[PDB]
């Protein structure tokens, strides 16, 4: 999945 701070 995406990292905690991704987007």
């Amino acid at each position, epitope marked *: *999945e995406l990292d*905690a*701070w991704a987007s």
Partner: antibody
Amino acid sequence: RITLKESGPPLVKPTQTLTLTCSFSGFSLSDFGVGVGWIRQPPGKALEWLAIIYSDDDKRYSPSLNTRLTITKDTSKNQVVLVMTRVSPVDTATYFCAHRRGPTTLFGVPIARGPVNAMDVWGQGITVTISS
Amino acid sequence: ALQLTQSPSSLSASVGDRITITCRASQGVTSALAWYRQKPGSPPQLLIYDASSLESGVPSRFSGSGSGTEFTLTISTLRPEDFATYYCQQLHFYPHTFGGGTRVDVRR
């Protein structure tokens, strides 16, 4: 000044459970967005990511080792523990814990996520050998 | 899972040279990439975070660039302490991932 240090048994036998402790200072695990992760390095090999735990208690694990790993934090003792079950010879390695910065904030408002892109401070590493 | 390939795995160099090392991700990781230098018997030391930011207390000869799938770390003027092993790490997707490392030794 942030410092982290790993502690645990230098020798462990196959099928046994390995419990490693990361004791740190210079930061609080209850601080916003901060994280502490574990990385291992088998002799002569590359670094391998194991897991990470954040202040809000969100946990993430290596998919490859997921079933044998547990990570928890003890905010009051400033420690993060990693438990690896059913160890085998292939787990012999140096284990490092490291700090992950949270987003930069301004008057309580996160304004920069750039510093979260790295593990900025590392422990010296603890050598663990797995043999019967 | 996502893969990080470092190039070259091994590199010969002499004091004073300018060297560059590359790290390529199998999928775009935006700018969430860090570079470390590791001396034998010591833990990795953060050099560059977020692809190009210079970590505090790290000497200016180090810099990094790139985004998406291609990244490069360059040491403008190599010093004796740079003979070591370098790693890149991606932190855009879980699990975070390290590259296979690139060894930099004294040329002869």
